[PDB]
């Protein structure tokens, strides 16, 4: 039963690639998001 | 008369400082400003 699980393989190929690109997009948005000042918008800050 | 010109020194000290900081601000805004796509705002392009 530790080797039986199919995981996400039961999904169709199109839906599987859609889920993969959604996960990648969410991770990238979190990793490279920027905010900056209302008065000096030339320099922005990351999160970390 | 090539050495006699008073230049910008006739201005008051506060006004001279104001003009200098205005010029520096304008140059920096031109140099470091950037724009980016409406759909993927994570990466933004400079001018040059
Ligand atoms: C994991 O994947 C297997 C095969 O990929 C799946 O088995 C299917 O099971 C149904 C119902 O018994 C059969 O009618 C199909 O013919 C099987 N294969 C197909 C074509 O999907 C099953 O979904 C999963 N097995 C477990 C234990 O979770
Ligand atoms: C710039 O040089 C001029 C030329 O002398 C200086 O002008 C003086 O003030 C008035 C306006 O020209 C004149 O009537 C005086 O004869 C000038 N005497 C001086 C030396 O003040 C002016 O002072 C100089 N500007 C600065 C910032 O020193």
From Swiss-Prot, chains A, B:
Subcellular localization, as worded in the UniProt entry: Cell membrane; Cytoplasm; Cell projection, Cilium; Apical cell membrane
Parent-record interval covered: 98 to 145 of 805
PTM note: Proteolytic cleavage by ADAM17 generates a secreted form. Also cleaved by serine proteases: TMPRSS2, TMPRSS11D and HPN/TMPRSS1.
Task performed by this protein: Essential counter-regulatory carboxypeptidase of the renin-angiotensin hormone system that is a critical regulator of blood volume, systemic vascular resistance, and thus cardiovascular homeostasis. Converts angiotensin I to angiotensin 1-9, a nine-amino acid peptide with anti-hypertrophic effects in cardiomyocytes, and angiotensin II to angiotensin 1-7, which then acts as a beneficial vasodilator and anti-proliferation agent, counterbalancing the actions of the vasoconstrictor angiotensin II. (Microbial infection) Acts as a receptor for human coronaviruses SARS-CoV and SARS-CoV-2, as well as human coronavirus NL63/HCoV-NL63.
Quaternary context: Homodimer. Interacts with the catalytically active form of TMPRSS2. Interacts with SLC6A19; this interaction is essential for expression and function of SLC6A19 in intestine. Interacts with ITGA5:ITGB1. Interacts (via PDZ-binding motif) with NHERF1 (via PDZ domains); the interaction may enhance ACE2 membrane residence. (Microbial infection) Interacts with SARS coronavirus/SARS-CoV spike protein.
Swiss-Prot/TrEMBL induction comment: Up-regulated in failing heart. Expression is induced by IFNA and IFNG. Exposure to cigarette smoke increases expression in lungs. Expression is decreased in nasal and bronchial epithelium of individuals with allergy after allergen challenge. IL13 stimulation decreases expression in nasal and bronchial epithelium.
Residues bearing glycans: 6
Protein's recorded name: Angiotensin-converting enzyme 2
Residue pairs linked by disulfide bridges in the UniProt entry: 36-44
Segments forming a coiled coil: none
Biotechnology: An engeneered stable, dimeric and secreted receptor with combined mutations that increase the affinity for human coronavirus SARS-CoV-2 spike protein shows potent SARS-CoV and SARS-CoV-2 neutralization in vitro.
Domain comment in the entry: The extracellular region of the ACE2 enzyme is composed of two domains. The first is a zinc metallopeptidase domain (residues 19-611). The second domain is located at the C-terminus (residues 612-740) and is 48% identical to human collectrin. The cytoplasmic tail contains several linear motifs such as LIR, PDZ-binding, PTB and endocytic sorting signal motifs that would allow interaction with proteins that mediate endocytic trafficking and autophagy.
Tissue/organ expression: Expressed in endothelial cells from small and large arteries, and in arterial smooth muscle cells (at protein level). Expressed in enterocytes of the small intestine, Leydig cells and Sertoli cells (at protein level). Expressed in the renal proximal tubule and the small intestine (at protein level). Expressed in heart, kidney, testis, and gastrointestinal system (at protein level). In lung, expressed at low levels in some alveolar type 2 cells, the expression seems to be individual-specific (at protein level). Expressed in nasal epithelial cells (at protein level).
Effect of residue 13 to P: No effect on interaction with SARS-CoV spike glycoprotein
Family from the record: Belongs to the peptidase M2 family.
């Amino acid at each position: 039963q530790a080797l039986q699980q199919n995981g996400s393989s039961v999904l169709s190929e199109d839906k599987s690639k859609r889920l993969n690109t959604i996960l990648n997009t969410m991770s990238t948005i979190y990793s490279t998001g920027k905010v900056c000042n209302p008065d000096n918008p030339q320099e922005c800050l990351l999160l970390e």
